[PDB]
Amino acid sequence: GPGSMENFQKVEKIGEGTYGVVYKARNKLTGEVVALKKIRLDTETEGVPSTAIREISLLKELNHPNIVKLLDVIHTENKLYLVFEFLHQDLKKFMDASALTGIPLPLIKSYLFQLLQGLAFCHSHRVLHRDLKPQNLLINTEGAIKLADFGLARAFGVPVRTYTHEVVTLWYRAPEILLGCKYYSTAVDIWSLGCIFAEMVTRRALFPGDSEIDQLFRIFRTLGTPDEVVWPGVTSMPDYKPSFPKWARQDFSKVVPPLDEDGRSLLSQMLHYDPNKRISAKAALAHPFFQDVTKPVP
């Protein structure tokens, strides 16, 4: 497009997906620091990967301050270069390295508020993210946080069709996926954000299971085992089994003790079993938890 490799100076390697490496680079003409994702095609026998086709096509359309920006695509015969806006850190590294005694409540609130804006924008543009987790949320020095990594994302129709199953890194995966439901929707992204919300408060994953069935059990032990009353249809779902242990719902103030009443409310509405009752990003932006939201920097 409007760019060539000649104008970038590589600085260091910042990352590596299953597609290849990411480097921090600098535009020698403008000064701009960028992230270069290299996708190698020469090595590809199946042409341009679908993951990349989705990432590029979907990201081209998503201009929003809380969505990482695809600046350019450099398209050689052997290689594909995605040029991205550069951000210094992800939320996972931030929680591990600097949030040793906690993320302050103002910053949690600011981050969650920005993530909801970003996600709301995705849903409004018929895009499911399908891999929201702390590793895929990028923070800058200005206090912004941005949805990143749209390699697992998907353009949806209304109503949704059956899409790929076992999507979403396991710890962040919604019950409706774990129970093998024919259809899933925007609610799967909210679940992930719910898990992340909790994770920002405690600095530890809310449901760190080691298999599909263990993930379900840890969720059920925290939120109670769902039945027809809380979630109509649950007991009909393909991978629902009647033999499931029936755990009691624990009071929500025990799930995330440091959290205030508004927090708890918002969290409960993000982690509702029934995807139909689960709160939307758009509605969540109005929740009282955000009444005093600011944008503090890390």
Binding site: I53, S57, E61, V73, R126, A155, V158, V160, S185, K282
Partner: protein, 262 residues
């Protein structure tokens, strides 16, 4: 419920309306093509219909591919010997975009009866990506149809299938469907389907949603009604064969209405 995305359906409809305009092919491009014709295009699309059913691809994939092809042929002049190569790469790209399990490149080579090599298919893949500038999330007839369907009271699967069928028939014939947006052909197709099966007409709720009336749909509707009447005679028959299937409620066997009464 959430499967119909209550909180986003309007935003999405509005967005699709703006995008269908951006993704629109050039209405007059076939006259500007020295070596290919509407007739050759119809042959290609009919073939892609057969490819979709042999590999049990989504209908959405079929629609995306036709969008890619028409946009490509809007700026790139193609010899008749290469038309199929464009179509094949289009179908591959559309498959990678929309399918859970796309056919492998080699299968795409296979269906071309070794007219082309895997290298030619992959290089064309790259060319199409360049020409479209990766702009692949195109609104289709289907994307509008599925939304319009939410306005049936109650849902009628014969209506739904017949609307899909009519919409697919429109892909075959650049003249005259290149001149109508997906949203408008979808509307025409929904009303015709609804009228054919139940006698009912384009609902007021869809007038509210879309701003379209039978007034504004009338041109397209007249064309679609003709296409439906002469479908048993069309040279291209693969869509009619596919809609005889039970998956689609055998709606191709339904009889077209002889008149629309406005």
């Amino acid at each position: 419920g959430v499967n119909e995305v209550p909180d986003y359906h309007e935003d999405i409809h509005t967005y699709l309306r703006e995008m269908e305009v951006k993704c629109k092919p050039k209405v007059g491009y076939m006259k500007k093509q020295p070596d290919i014709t509407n007739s050759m295009r119809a042959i290609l699309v009919d073939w892609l219909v057969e490819v979709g059913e042999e590999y049990k691809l989504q209908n959405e994939t079929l629609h995306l591919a036709v969008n890619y092809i028409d946009r490509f042929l809007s700026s790139m002049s193609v010899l008749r010997g290469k038309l199929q190569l464009v179509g094949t790469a289009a179908m591959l790209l559309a498959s990678k975009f929309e399918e859970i399990y796309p056919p492998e490149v080699a299968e795409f080579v296979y269906i071309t009866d070794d007219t082309y090599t895997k290298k030619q298919v992959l290089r064309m893949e790259h060319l199409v990506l360049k020409v479209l500038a990766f702009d692949l999330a195109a609104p289709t007839i289907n994307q509008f149809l599925t939304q319009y369907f939410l306005h049936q009271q109650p849902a009628n699967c014969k209506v739904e299938s017949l609307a899909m069928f009519l919409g697919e028939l429109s892909l075959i014939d650049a003249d005259p469907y290149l001149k109508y947006l997906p949203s408008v052909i979808a509307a025409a197709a929904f009303h015709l389907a609804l009228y054919t099966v139940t006698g009912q007409s384009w609902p007021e709720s869809l007038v509210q949603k879309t701003g379209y009336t039978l007034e504004t749909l009338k041109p397209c509707l007249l064309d679609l009604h003709q296409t439906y009447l002469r479908a048993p005679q069309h040279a291209q028959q693969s869509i009619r064969e596919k809609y005889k299937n039970s998956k689609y409620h055998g709606v191709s066997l339904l009889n077209p209405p002889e008149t629309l009464n406005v």
